[PDB]
Design a protein around this ligand. Structure first.
Ligand SMILES: Cn1cnc2ncn(Cc3nc([C@@H]4CO[C@@H](c5ccc(F)cc5)C4)no3)c(=O)c21
Lengths: 270, 43, 40, 40
């Protein structure tokens, strides 16, 4: 009991007295009524000095009744200074899975802790699906975590965060269609990166802008923007240019040949 | 006044529905030849 | 006015949730420094 | 009603943020007068 209270409330001097009295490690790893341990209690409430002291005393990254780690609690609460203590000391901890297949990155993302997602994602955390075949990026999208997904889109890992999804799932689809479905202002941000400006000089006759269509293709994204009433995404320059490209590609020539086939009966009759 | 209310979406919806219908009918090799993953424009 | 009557109410709620976040961190500072004797 | 509904919403939030600021003064008065021994 007394160390679970002292660790849970950050009582660093009470811990130093409890651990000098109880110099054996059996007290330092005891199991709470819900299966937690002093190192979990400290990380859950976010005490960087205590979780550090318990690791300096040689506590172990044991797992909850639900299989959660001290890093899963630190992430669930968004306590990035406690995560930094753990991610400094034992980098091998970073990819451990709970009883349901979530990582700490799936917890930081679901709960909306953008800077905790940034820290685990930059500490080379393993992007993966849990037992419900869902990514951390899906868990952010399905909970409307705008600052989490802007962090994931602005990430040096975005195109890796995009390729890791279940193609066989109707519930956890192509992440670009899930952004149009749940978080369309994050899709405005993602399409702004598809416009490249080649002068910063709009008065120059030679000025040009380039549009890249890699997020509109695998008309799935525009069907999805129509089926979700995303009128301010339909009216974006990259969408107006993708459709006008599709019309000049084949659709104009398709329509003009139907009309030209009809005119060949119509005009000779008049 | 209700066609002109919904018009802004309906026009893009009509274009999207036209092109998807054509792309379901046309052959994959022609789409791979004739589709174009990026375009430059001069304002 | 509602296109801005709701907008300032967003910012007043945002500075309220900021004040509650600053205050939650002082309640923890109390329990961390508090002289717990005769209750343990 | 919304042209005066949101007007009362403003005032309930304005007197809520007043109460939260009165309470933030009392929590600082605790840490200021609080007896700290052991946890220094
Ligand atoms: C990309 N693009 C650039 N110029 C284009 N011209 C033609 N097409 C094909 C095409 N147009 C159309 C019509 C346009 O107006 C639509 C309309 C407006 C308001 C309403 F309320 C209802 C219907 C219907 N239906 O299909 C292109 O795709 C294209």
């Amino acid at each position: 009991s007394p160390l679970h209270f002292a660790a849970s409330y950050g009582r660093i001097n009470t811990c130093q007295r409890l651990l000098q009295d109880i110099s054996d490690t059996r007290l330092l790893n005891e199991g709470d009524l819900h299966g937690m341990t002093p190192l979990h209690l400290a990380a859950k409430n976010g005490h960087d000095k205590v979780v550090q002291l318990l690791l300096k005393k040689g506590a172990l990254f044991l797992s909850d009744h639900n299989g959660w780690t001290a890093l899963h609690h630190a992430s669930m609460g968004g306590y990035t200074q406690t995560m930094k203590v753990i991610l400094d000391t034992n980098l091998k901890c970073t990819d451990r899975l709970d009883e349901d297949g979530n990582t700490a990155l799936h917890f930081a993302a679901r709960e909306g802790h953008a800077k905790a997602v940034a820290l685990l994602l930059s500490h080379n955390a393993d992007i993966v699906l849990n037992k419900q075949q869902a990514s951390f990026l899906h868990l952010a999208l399905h909970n409307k975590r705008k600052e989490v997904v802007l962090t994931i889109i602005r990430s040096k890992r975005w195109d890796e965060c995009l390729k890791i999804f279940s193609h066989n799932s109707p519930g956890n689809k192509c992440p670009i269609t899930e952004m149009i479905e749940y978080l369309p202002e994050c899709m405005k941000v993602l399409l702004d990166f598809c416009m490249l400006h080649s002068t910063e000089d709009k008065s120059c006759r030679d000025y040009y802008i380039e549009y890249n269509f890699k997020y509109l293709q695998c008309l799935t994204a525009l069907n999805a923007m129509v089926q979700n009433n995303r009128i301010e995404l339909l009216n974006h320059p990259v969408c107006k240019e993708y459709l006008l490209m599709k019309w000049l590609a084949y659709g104009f020539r398709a329509h003009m040949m139907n009309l030209g086939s009809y005119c060949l009966g119509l005009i000779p009759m008049t | 006044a209700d066609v002109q209310k919904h018009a802004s979406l309906k026009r893009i919806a009509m274009q999207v529905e036209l092109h998807t219908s054509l792309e379901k009918k046309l052959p994959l090799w022609f789409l791979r030849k004739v589709d174009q993953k990026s375009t430059i424009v001069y304002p | 006015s509602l296109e801005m009557e709701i907008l300032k109410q967003k910012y007043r709620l945002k500075d309220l949730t900021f004040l509650l976040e600053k205050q939650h961190e002082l309640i923890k500072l109390i329990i961390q420094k508090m002289e717990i004797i005769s209750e343990t």
